[PDB]
Design a protein around this motif. Structure first.
Motif, PDB file in Angstrom:
ATOM      1  N   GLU A 185      48.077  48.601  36.464  1.00 35.72           N
ATOM      2  CA  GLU A 185      49.548  48.681  36.992  1.00 35.72           C
ATOM      3  C   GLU A 185      49.912  49.735  36.819  1.00 35.72           C
ATOM      4  OE1 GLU A 185      51.865  45.256  36.740  1.00 35.72           O
ATOM      5  OE2 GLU A 185      50.269  43.837  37.474  1.00 35.72           O
ATOM      6  N   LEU A 187      42.508  57.222  34.697  1.00 40.92           N
ATOM      7  CA  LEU A 187      41.396  57.315  34.020  1.00 40.92           C
ATOM      8  C   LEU A 187      40.788  55.844  33.573  1.00 40.92           C
ATOM      9  CD1 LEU A 187      38.987  59.193  33.497  1.00 40.92           C
ATOM     10  CD2 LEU A 187      40.013  59.479  31.325  1.00 40.92           C
ATOM     11  N   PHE A 194      37.494  44.261  31.177  1.00 43.17           N
ATOM     12  CA  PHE A 194      38.318  43.673  30.449  1.00 43.17           C
ATOM     13  C   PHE A 194      39.800  43.383  31.389  1.00 43.17           C
ATOM     14  CE2 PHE A 194      42.370  43.566  28.055  1.00 43.17           C
ATOM     15  CZ  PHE A 194      42.058  42.461  27.132  1.00 43.17           C
ATOM     16  N   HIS A 195      40.238  44.312  32.054  1.00 41.30           N
ATOM     17  CA  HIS A 195      41.586  44.247  32.771  1.00 41.30           C
ATOM     18  C   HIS A 195      41.269  43.392  34.165  1.00 41.30           C
ATOM     19  CE1 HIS A 195      42.267  47.475  30.088  1.00 41.30           C
ATOM     20  NE2 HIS A 195      43.306  46.719  29.986  1.00 41.30           N
ATOM     21  N   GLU A 196      42.037  42.981  34.671  1.00 44.51           N
ATOM     22  CA  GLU A 196      42.245  42.241  36.007  1.00 44.51           C
ATOM     23  C   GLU A 196      42.350  43.591  36.855  1.00 44.51           C
ATOM     24  OE1 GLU A 196      41.671  39.016  37.350  1.00 44.51           O
ATOM     25  OE2 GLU A 196      40.791  38.877  35.357  1.00 44.51           O
ATOM     26  N   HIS A 197      43.432  44.311  36.757  1.00 41.64           N
ATOM     27  CA  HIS A 197      43.685  45.623  37.405  1.00 41.64           C
ATOM     28  C   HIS A 197      44.567  46.526  36.521  1.00 41.64           C
ATOM     29  CE1 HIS A 197      47.188  42.867  38.026  1.00 41.64           C
ATOM     30  NE2 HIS A 197      47.879  43.751  37.716  1.00 41.64           N
ATOM     31  N   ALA A 205      35.548  57.311  33.595  1.00 41.93           N
ATOM     32  CA  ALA A 205      35.082  57.922  32.331  1.00 41.93           C
ATOM     33  C   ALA A 205      33.692  57.407  31.768  1.00 41.93           C
ATOM     34  CB  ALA A 205      36.119  57.357  31.120  1.00 41.93           C
ATOM     35  N   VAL A 206      33.027  56.408  32.192  1.00 46.71           N
ATOM     36  CA  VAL A 206      31.991  55.961  31.935  1.00 46.71           C
ATOM     37  C   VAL A 206      30.831  56.894  32.698  1.00 46.71           C
ATOM     38  CG1 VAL A 206      29.952  54.053  32.273  1.00 46.71           C
ATOM     39  CG2 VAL A 206      32.369  53.707  31.547  1.00 46.71           C
ATOM     40  N   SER A 257      38.045  52.948  32.054  1.00 46.80           N
ATOM     41  CA  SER A 257      36.864  52.551  31.297  1.00 46.80           C
ATOM     42  C   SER A 257      36.782  51.088  31.129  1.00 46.80           C
ATOM     43  CB  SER A 257      37.120  53.183  29.867  1.00 46.80           C
ATOM     44  OG  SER A 257      37.075  54.460  29.494  1.00 46.80           O
ATOM     45  N   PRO A 258      35.706  50.441  30.916  1.00 51.56           N
ATOM     46  CA  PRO A 258      35.648  48.924  31.127  1.00 51.56           C
ATOM     47  C   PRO A 258      36.797  48.269  30.053  1.00 51.56           C
ATOM     48  CG  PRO A 258      33.359  49.761  30.705  1.00 51.56           C
ATOM     49  CD  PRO A 258      34.458  51.067  30.581  1.00 51.56           C
ATOM     50  N   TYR A 259      37.203  48.807  29.029  1.00 50.15           N
ATOM     51  CA  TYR A 259      38.186  48.055  28.228  1.00 50.15           C
ATOM     52  C   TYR A 259      39.645  49.067  28.042  1.00 50.15           C
ATOM     53  CZ  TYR A 259      35.409  43.969  27.025  1.00 50.15           C
ATOM     54  OH  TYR A 259      34.529  42.882  27.033  1.00 50.15           O
ATOM     55  N   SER A 260      39.728  50.151  28.698  1.00 47.14           N
ATOM     56  CA  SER A 260      40.820  50.886  28.424  1.00 47.14           C
ATOM     57  C   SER A 260      41.201  51.436  29.772  1.00 47.14           C
ATOM     58  CB  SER A 260      40.362  51.902  27.589  1.00 47.14           C
ATOM     59  OG  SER A 260      41.427  53.006  27.313  1.00 47.14           O
ATOM     60  N   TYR A 261      42.557  51.786  30.329  1.00 46.55           N
ATOM     61  CA  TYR A 261      42.830  52.764  31.257  1.00 46.55           C
ATOM     62  C   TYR A 261      43.994  53.605  30.844  1.00 46.55           C
ATOM     63  CZ  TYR A 261      46.563  49.927  32.661  1.00 46.55           C
ATOM     64  OH  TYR A 261      47.925  49.279  33.036  1.00 46.55           O
ATOM     65  N   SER A 262      43.844  54.814  31.257  1.00 51.94           N
ATOM     66  CA  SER A 262      44.984  55.615  30.999  1.00 51.94           C
ATOM     67  C   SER A 262      45.681  56.152  32.251  1.00 51.94           C
ATOM     68  CB  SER A 262      44.441  56.992  30.138  1.00 51.94           C
ATOM     69  OG  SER A 262      43.788  56.520  29.090  1.00 51.94           O
ATOM     70  N   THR A 263      46.851  56.443  32.414  1.00 53.56           N
ATOM     71  CA  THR A 263      47.460  56.770  33.498  1.00 53.56           C
ATOM     72  C   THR A 263      48.751  57.966  33.439  1.00 53.56           C
ATOM     73  OG1 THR A 263      48.633  55.978  35.754  1.00 53.56           O
ATOM     74  CG2 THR A 263      49.088  54.885  33.715  1.00 53.56           C
TER      75      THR A 263
END
Ligand SMILES: CC/C(=C(/CC)c1ccc(O)cc1)c1ccc(O)cc1
Ligand SMILES: CC/C(=C(/CC)c1ccc(O)cc1)c1ccc(O)cc1
Lengths: 115, 115, 115, 115
Positions: free
Chosen positions: C83, C101, C78-81, C10-11, C103-109
């Protein structure tokens, strides 16, 4: 405060501060009339856009000026802005929170509607 | 195909099929002129919207008719539609994929720009 | 291929390439046993993880190594991984696509389950 | 309150109420030790999980029990839960807000980290 807008930055992990927000309301002629505008605070929140009296039934467009936000941070983003278009108050007055999460090539938005 | 749209459904865990999509290009008088349109396929994809020759630099608006999609499913939606507004920029060879993930009260969109 | 993983950035507005992905299956002692793994391709996709014969009903964990991906890009994550934990259920013919998807401090699945 | 969790429902457009949340911290042995747990309020928020003293440096996993949430609403979701795994307080104490947006086949999470 029947309308609140909250914006977060997914790159920095922080509120998105000083983001311009414009709200329009569809008029009888089917054009988008200016309704209210403001800027998010240090908490990424924008309150006080409107009042229960002014916020009548109608179709509203909340335009979040994401491009200006990213460019002020020295970043070239994909979107001109983020737009949230919805019918409001069709079954009586509600309180709406419009939340948006921003990345340079992506945005995500959700609405919380309470009675 | 310089422009592709892909739409998925977060409620059913499936492509969003038969979703109407309208693309507009901003005109000199700041109005939005119809540019291309279609309906997503069984895979949730809409190809063949435009050609390299037609897809010049400019500001484009992609409107995804989410309200009708949810209505056809018997599910109560929040948004009138989902909107993606962006500038197309000629930076070497570029294909634009506009992806959108739909929920009744939320949507998320990202752009993939590849060579 | 009953299982596919797709990862976008997303970046940068691009597929997330060369991202490590590990899949585990829950064992009777509640521990996670390695099941399959790989790295996303230039299209951000990872195919060939498993076969119909091997992919039996059970609980699976898909770990996407987002921290390393961001590190390779010089971006602070931010996240380790990321999941994704889900039960696979035999309801007629089904292919599972796990999309994420980043982003450094977010993810969407989201999951797409099609026939 | 150095750790807060906020959960919204993308189907209903409301806070996700009574969602169970478990937090684990990676121990010296590399196992996941129970750290704290609670349930979201009517506002979808969970405060008071921990204190500045207890919330030391470490790798934490916040597991949001999305499956139980959806099933209590009479819905069969895809995910067992939503997991957020991150190193915390590595450069001194921070305040973390972990926000998650839920749909039956999808979830999205972001972190707000303040000093
Ligand atoms: C992960 C981005 C994505 C999607 C599907 C539209 C997405 C969009 C927004 C989100 O918040 C999460 C996922 C997608 C992109 C290309 C594909 O071929 C399939 C899926
Ligand atoms: C989880 C919804 C959400 C956000 C942050 C804007 C969100 C929105 C869309 C997504 O896809 C994911 C998260 C949020 C709402 C209220 C807050 O005080 C903080 C965060």
């Amino acid at each position: 405060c029947p309308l609140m807008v909250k914006v977060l930055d997914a790159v920095r992990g922080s509120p998105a501060i000083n983001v311009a927000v414009h709200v329009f309301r569809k008029a009888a002629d089917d054009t988008w009339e200016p309704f209210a505008s403001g800027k998010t605070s240090e908490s990424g929140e924008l309150h006080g856009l409107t009042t229960e009296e002014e916020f009548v039934e109608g179709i509203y467009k909340v335009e979040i000026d994401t491009k200006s936000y990213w460019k002020a941070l020295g970043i070239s983003p994909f979107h001109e802005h983020a737009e949230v278009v919805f019918t409001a108050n069709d079954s009586g007055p509600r309180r709406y929170t419009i939340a948006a999460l921003l990345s340079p090539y992506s945005y995500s938005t959700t609405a919380v509607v309470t009675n």
